[PDB]
């Protein structure tokens, strides 16, 4: 009809409602993120925890970490047979 403001209508809606939702998820995701792998908390030792944080730790995760249980139970069971048999 006459003059208007075709571009200035970005007030009524920002570009990309789906991109806006994605970016809003991105802001919460990236902001509420550790600076560089923060909050590790690996070490622990209290009676059994000295074995948990050492033997159930994934630095090795080899076969001996489970085999310690077998060796210990064998130590218990040999005395069990000695007191039993």
């Amino acid at each position: 009809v006459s003059t208007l403001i075709p571009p200035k209508v970005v007030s009524s809606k920002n570009i990309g409602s789906a991109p806006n939702a994605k970016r809003i998820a991105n802001v919460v995701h990236f902001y509420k993120s550790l600076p560089q792998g923060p909050a590790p908390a690996i070490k622990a030792n209290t009676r059994l925890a000295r074995y948990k944080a050492k033997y159930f730790d994934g630095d090795n995760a080899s076969g001996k970490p489970l085999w310690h249980f077998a060796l210990g139970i064998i130590a218990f069971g040999y005395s069990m047979e000695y007191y039993f048999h």
Binding site: T3, P6, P7, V10, I15
Partner: protein, 57 residues
């Protein structure tokens, strides 16, 4: 200097990737261009708004 007056709109159309879809701004640009075209037509085709009374009478 009517080049500059439409130069801004030409540049906008060059960058209207976010402004593409102007439903009633291109119509306004058409109205502005039609006004200039009719103005140039009145200037060129129509003679002086006067009378050649010096000799014609």
């Amino acid at each position: 200097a009517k080049s500059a007056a439409n130069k801004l709109d030409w540049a906008k159309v060059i960058s209207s990737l976010r402004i593409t879809g102007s439903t009633a701004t291109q119509l306004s640009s058409f109205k502005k261009r039609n006004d200039e075209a009719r103005r140039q037509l009145l200037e060129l085709q129509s003679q002086p708004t006067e009378v050649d009374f010096s000799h014609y009478r």
